[PDB]
Amino acid sequence: LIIIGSFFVLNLVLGVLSGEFSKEREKAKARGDFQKLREKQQLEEDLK
Amino acid sequence: KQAEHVPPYDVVPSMRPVVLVGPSLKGYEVTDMMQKALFDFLKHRFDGRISITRVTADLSLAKRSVLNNPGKRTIIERSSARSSIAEVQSEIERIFELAKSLQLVVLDADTINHPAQLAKTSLAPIIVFVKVSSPKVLQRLIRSRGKSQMKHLTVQMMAYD
Bridge partners (DSSP) listed for residue B19: B107, B127
User: DSSP assignment, residue A43?
Assistant: H
Phi, psi of B132 (to 5 degrees): -105, 20
Contacts of A38 in chain B (CB under 8 A): none
Bridge partners (DSSP) listed for residue B53: B107
Does the CB of B21 have a partner CB in chain A at under 8 Å?
A: no
Is residue B13 reached through a cis peptide bond, with omega within 30 degrees of 0 on the bond before it? no
- Among residues B33, B88, B13, B15, the alpha carbon closest in space to that of B55 is found at B88
Q: Show Cβ contacts of residue B65 under 8 Å, excluding neighbours closer than 6 positions.
A: none
Phi, psi of B35 (to 5 degrees): -75, -30
The strand pair at B126-129 and B104-107 is best described as unpaired
Q: What gap in Å lies between CA B87 and CA B78, rounded to an integer? A: 15
Resolution for the entry shown, Å: 3.3
Distance of CA A1 to the CA centre of its chain: 32
Q: Which residue of A has its CA nearest to B143?
A: A47
How far is B39 from chain A, CA to nearest CA, in Å?
21
Does the CB of A46 have a partner CB in chain B at under 8 Å?
A: yes
Q: What gap in Å lies between CA B146 and CA B139, rounded to an integer? A: 13
Does the CB of A37 have a partner CB in chain B at under 8 Å?
A: no
Count the neighbouring beta carbons within 10 Å of the beta carbon of residue A33. Answer: 11
Count the neighbouring beta carbons within 10 Å of the beta carbon of residue B19. Answer: 20
Q: What gap in Å lies between CA B16 and CA B9, rounded to an integer? A: 16
Interchain CB contacts (distance < 8 Å): A and B: 11
Report which secondary-structure segment, H or E, holds B18.
strand B18-21
Bridge partners (DSSP) listed for residue B105: B51
- Among residues B16, B20, B17, the alpha carbon closest in space to that of B36 is found at B20
User: DSSP assignment, residue A8?
Assistant: I
Query: A47–B140: do the CB atoms touch at under 8 Å?
Result: yes
Q: What gap in Å lies between CA A14 and CA A18, rounded to an integer? A: 6
Domain residues for B93? Answer: 16-161
How far is A29 from chain B, CA to nearest CA, in Å?
23
Q: At what angle do helices B135-143 and A33-47 cross, to 10 degrees?
A: 50
Cβ atoms of residues B56 and B110 within 8 Å: yes
DSSP codes, B67-132? -SSTT--TTS-STTTSSTHHHHHHHHHHHHHHHHTSSEEEE--SS---TTGGGSSSS--EEEE---
Contacts of A43 in chain B (CB under 8 A): 134, 136-137
